[PDB]
């Protein structure tokens, strides 16, 4: 039984003294019995002398030294299964939905190690999506890092949502949205919100797993969320072989977590004061997002940079890893477009002309034209008037108001909010659509025709019914 | 007299002091005593000094365990017995608090009795959960008008009041508590916030002055005043804010609703500068410790509206954040931003130009908002907003010949600027908010001269009163406005304007 | 006709002065950001040198 005695609690660094040649190995997970149920310690250092030096996950407030610590022997090991789906679940691996234990299949260690260099992808692959915004101007890809920008609420968590709908038609995957620096009041919200639009049925199914990571938890287990909940995506794409869509909170805050605690352990935090093992933690968590040969996990990453400055540290290691960013815009918001996506800042390195398919491809340069020269024409022309329009201008601002209309489409999930049934529209359909707009066999049917309705067969409907 | 109370006291204390676990200082320097001794100590332990000196023990290391003193090194000195309590901090909970100014430890620095209260409970504890959470949708009115419409406030929320230095940010604040006598009467405790002011490094004058026109304005019988004056040492103000929320959590947990106001946490964070720093630990971003943000994180998530199976109750915060140059790019306010739910951004040059309230409308924001705000005030300042978006826009627009609508919204901004103006220390009734703000959504006030909006103001409230306190009575008791009190409010209002 | 065109030309440059100040307001409001971040860093290397010594 391996077991040592606390020899010291400066802060929540908790030295633990262990009999000789019992010593766990380092990333080891160490479980204090306590009155707090255990206290979870990780290994991060041996200090010698049979002693270690440990990070406490949970809090160390009112410990008493030379209390006795068994240890687990190996990264904390987190119930993992198909029941385990609709689970709010902490970082111990153990319920906060309350709904008491969780039903598990098998346990798994939370560190886990990024697959090989062949058992990376090989070759780019595109992940479905329903918004044609998303499919269009920055699809989604298999294996990803898709970074959000832009405000929460009706913004963020709305899209979120969406995307648990969408995903659940488009393969039938799951999720894991791991909230890290979580205001427990709005999580709150969202859960039962989540609960309330389906996506979370526990009186039916839940395809999304919680992992909620309150503020109040301390820095060590801010940092141990996201691993924990990559374990479980994983489970699902290795071993239940699935595809899956890992919705990530603040990186900011994942950053701030790990920044803390390597302070803690004593590392000199690099400039911008950010940790010196800065880069290993985005490499090994963000390389453990791929598609791998069974499954693909993709993850969608929001992506909050303190002071809008991109210039700092963390937040170019993040768009390093991003292979694309969605720009949520507020002013399209008001436009009345629930996509509140900001055409021309939403951006994807995978929209290369093979990439995405060269017919996709030409269409969305077209469009992209448009839309560039519709806002740019529209800055002089509504100063100068909109009768100073040349005939080509004119046809351009007729399609381009036609296609402003057309990103309107509701989402599924916001069936409710809009009050208007979610147009859920394919990719092929997508480019299907476009083709037709740019060849302005719609530039004669009115702009609302195009508001609020999704892909091509979707607006020969309502052309008709605008009409009729 | 009282002097043989006092003996008879001492004769009360006999005690058997065989303290099972004896520390002696092996050396004091810099309040950071590292004692040989205390074996089985808790982490943040209270202990007990020769000097009499009041500790916590932030530092367990295996041969030394360093305490920190809270009290002053004055008479500390090397080798003294550092007797161990046994009892991780604790401070009394109970409603024995209303209308009595304590420090920390619970003393009564304004000597109004030694504190009776329900308990005595420790003063940290971890934030409610998720499903400890029912959401937000209660209003609390603070009784300036336009924080109830341009920011509506509600129960178990946090929302910044930050804003320049010496503004009378404490001010603005104390003009909340002031309204929430008028509630605090009402007999729903819910309707009875029973308020914390939080004075943290406030000299004892200024607090004396608080304290006086709290009396003044008899409102110290639902306030509670916990105080770390200037003087009072860095562990105090580092356990300030904690100690204050379990005050809080006793109301909470009882299922009432209570408002903290946490002023300034900024003063906090230099008290903890100056606890890292004298433990040697490496001062964050700023020079600010790198768990400011977990400090302050763990603080502000007890701040929390529990969920009706934990009966319906919260403790509704409102930090006050100092910006020293205005800075919201400062470390500490970008932190704290990105913590709280909501901000109130009060405008210097709005305060120099003597527009009390100060407030600055864009960068004033409320993420509960409107779901915590009363239906008739939002039907008639939905409207205000709007008028408000122009009137910002249009403001420039005061550099003259302009469009003939331009210019209306000009005037009609202008009048509803000086209205929004609420002479500090005289909060107003939401009764007499909403008829008011009708009279400028119907633009009855844009007519009335900028310099007449004051006394069109205090005379249409009694006009009013006069005409129709069973209209005002109603709209107040109603709380929504109807189709027939917003017409008999539009009628009412044109008669007014008559005169 | 003289004086209506020349008022009109003084409205004309004194608004695209006023966009062109802007533009050099952003760029030396973004140097301005990172030499704010530099001289942080500057004084965070003192600090961390001294409690290294």
């Given at each position: ?176 949205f791991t909230g890290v620096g979580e205001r427990?009041?709005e999580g709150?919200?969202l ?19 919680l992992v909620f990571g309150q ?10 969320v996201?691993?924990?909940g ?17 919705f990530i909170d603040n990186?900011?805050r ?48 929001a ?166 | ?499 | ?53």
């Amino acid at each position: 039984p391996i077991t040592g005695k606390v020899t010291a609690v400066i802060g929540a660094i908790v030295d633990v003294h262990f009999e000789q040649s019992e010593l766990p190995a380092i990333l080891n997970a160490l479980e204090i019995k306590t009155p707090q149920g255990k206290l979870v310690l990780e290994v991060a250092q041996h200090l010698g002398e049979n002693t270690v030096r440990t990070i406490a996950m949970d809090g160390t407030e009112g410990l008493v030294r030379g209390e006795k610590v068994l240890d687990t022997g190996g990264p904390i090991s987190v119930p993992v299964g198909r029941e385990t789906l609709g689970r709010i679940i902490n970082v111990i691996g153990e319920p906060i939905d309350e709904r008491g234990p969780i039903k598990s299949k098998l346990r798994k260690p939370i560190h886990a190690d990024p697959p090989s260099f062949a058992e990376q992808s090989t070759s780019a692959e595109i992940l479905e999506t329903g918004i044609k915004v998303v499919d269009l101007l920055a699809p989604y890809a298999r294996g990803g890092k898709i970074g959000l920008f832009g405000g929460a609420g009706v913004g963020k968590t709305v899209f979120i949502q969406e995307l648990i709908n969408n995903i659940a038609k488009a393969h039938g995957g799951f999720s894991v949205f791991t909230g890290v620096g979580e205001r427990t009041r709005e999580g709150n919200d969202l859960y039962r919100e989540m609960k309330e639009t389906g996506v979370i049925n526990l009186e039916g199914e839940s395809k999304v797993a919680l992992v909620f990571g309150q503020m109040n938890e301390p820095p060590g287990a801010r940092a141990r969320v996201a691993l924990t909940g990559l374990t479980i995506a994983e489970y699902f794409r290795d071993e239940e072989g699935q595809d899956v869509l890992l919705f990530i909170d603040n990186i900011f805050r994942f950053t701030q977590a790990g920044s803390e605690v390597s302070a803690l352990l004593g590392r000199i935090p690099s400039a911008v004061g950010y940790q010196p093992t800065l880069a290993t933690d985005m490499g090994l968590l963000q390389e453990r997002i791929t598609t791998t040969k069974k499954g693909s996990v993709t993850s969608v990453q929001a992506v909050y940079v303190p002071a809008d400055d991109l210039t700092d540290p963390a937040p170019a290691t993040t768009f390093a890893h991003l292979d694309a960013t969605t720009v949520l815009s507020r002013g399209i918001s008001e436009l009345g477009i629930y996509p509140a996506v900001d055409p021309l800042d939403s951006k994807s390195r995978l929209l290369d002309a093979a990439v995405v398919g060269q017919e996709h491809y030409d269409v969305a340069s077209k469009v992209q034209e448009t839309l560039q020269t519709y806002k740019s024409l529209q800055d002089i022309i509504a100063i100068l008037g909109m009768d100073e329009l040349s005939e080509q201008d004119k046809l351009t601002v007729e399609r381009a108001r036609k296609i402003q209309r057309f990103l309107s489409q509701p989402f599924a999930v916001a069936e409710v909010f809009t009050g208007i049934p979610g147009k859920l529209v394919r990719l092929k359909d997508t480019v299907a659509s476009f083709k037709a707009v740019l060849e302005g066999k719609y530039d004669n049917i009115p702009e609302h025709a195009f508001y609020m309705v999704g892909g091509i067969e979707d607006v020969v409907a309502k052309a008709e019914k605008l009409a009729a | 007299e009282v002097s043989s109370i006092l003996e008879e006291r001492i004769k009360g204390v006999s005690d058997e002091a065989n303290l099972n676990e004896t520390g002696r200082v092996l050396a004091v320097g810099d309040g950071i005593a590292r004692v040989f001794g205390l074996n089985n100590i808790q982490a943040e332990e209270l202990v007990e000094f020769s000097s009499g000196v009041k500790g916590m023990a932030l530092n367990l290391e295996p041969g030394q365990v360093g305490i920190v003193l809270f009290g002053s090194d004055r008479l500390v000195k090397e080798g003294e017995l550092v007797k161990r309590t046994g009892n991780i901090v604790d401070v009394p909970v109970g409603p024995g608090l209303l209308g009595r100014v304590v420090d920390a430890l619970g003393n009564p620095i304004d000597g109004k009795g030694p504190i009776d209260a329900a308990g005595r409970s420790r003063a940290q504890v971890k934030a409610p959960g998720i499903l400890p959470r029912r959401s937000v949708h209660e209003p609390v009115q603070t009784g300036l008008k336009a924080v109830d419409a341009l920011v509506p406030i509600g129960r178990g929320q946090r929302e910044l009041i930050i804003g320049d230095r010496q503004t009378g940010k404490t001010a603005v604040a104390l003009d909340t508590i002031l309204n929430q006598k008028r509630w605090n009467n009402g007999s729903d405790e819910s309707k009875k916030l029973y308020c914390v002011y939080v004075a943290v490094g406030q000299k004892r004058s200024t607090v004396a002055q608080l304290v006086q026109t709290l009396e003044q304005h008899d409102a110290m019988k639902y306030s509670i005043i916990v105080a770390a004056t200037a003087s009072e040492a860095a562990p105090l103000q580092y356990l300030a804010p904690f100690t204050a929320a379990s005050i809080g959590e006793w109301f909470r947990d009882n299922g009432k609703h209570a408002l903290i106001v946490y002023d300034d946490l900024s003063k906090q964070a230099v008290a903890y500068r100056q606890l890292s720093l004298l433990l040697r630990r490496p001062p964050g971003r700023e020079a600010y410790p790198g768990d400011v943000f977990y400090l302050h994180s763990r603080l502000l998530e007890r701040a929390a509206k529990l969920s009706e199976k934990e009966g319906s109750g919260s403790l509704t915060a409102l930090p006050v954040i100092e910006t020293q140059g205005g800075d919201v790019s400062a470390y500490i306010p970008t932190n704290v931003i990105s913590i709280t739910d909501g901000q109130i951004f009060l405008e210097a040059e709005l305060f120099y130009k003597g527009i009390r309230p100060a407030i600055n409308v864009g960068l004033s924001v409320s993420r509960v908002g409107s779901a915590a705000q009363v239906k008739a005030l939002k039907q008639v300042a939905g409207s205000l907003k709007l008028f408000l978006a122009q009137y910002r826009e249009v403001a420039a627009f005061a550099q003259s010949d302009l469009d003939a609508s331009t210019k209306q919204t000009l005037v009609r901004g202008e009048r509803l600027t000086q209205l929004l103006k609420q002479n500090q220390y005289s909060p107003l009734a939401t009764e007499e908010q909403v008829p008011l703000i009708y009279a400028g959504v119907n633009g009855h006030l844009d007519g009335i001269e900028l310099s007449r909006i004051g006394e069109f103001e205090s005379s249409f409230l009694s006009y009013l009163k006069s005409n129709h306190n069973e209209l005002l009575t109603e709209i107040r008791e109603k709380g929504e406005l109807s189709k027939e009190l917003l017409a008999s409010l539009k009628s009412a209002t044109e008669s007014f304007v008559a005169t | 006709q003289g004086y209506a065109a020349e008022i009109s030309a003084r409205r004309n440059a004194m608004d695209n002065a006023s966009k062109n100040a802007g533009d050099m307001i952003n760029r030396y409001s973004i140097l301005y950001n990172r030499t704010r971040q530099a001289v942080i860093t500057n004084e965070l290397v003192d600090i961390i040198t001294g409690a290294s010594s």
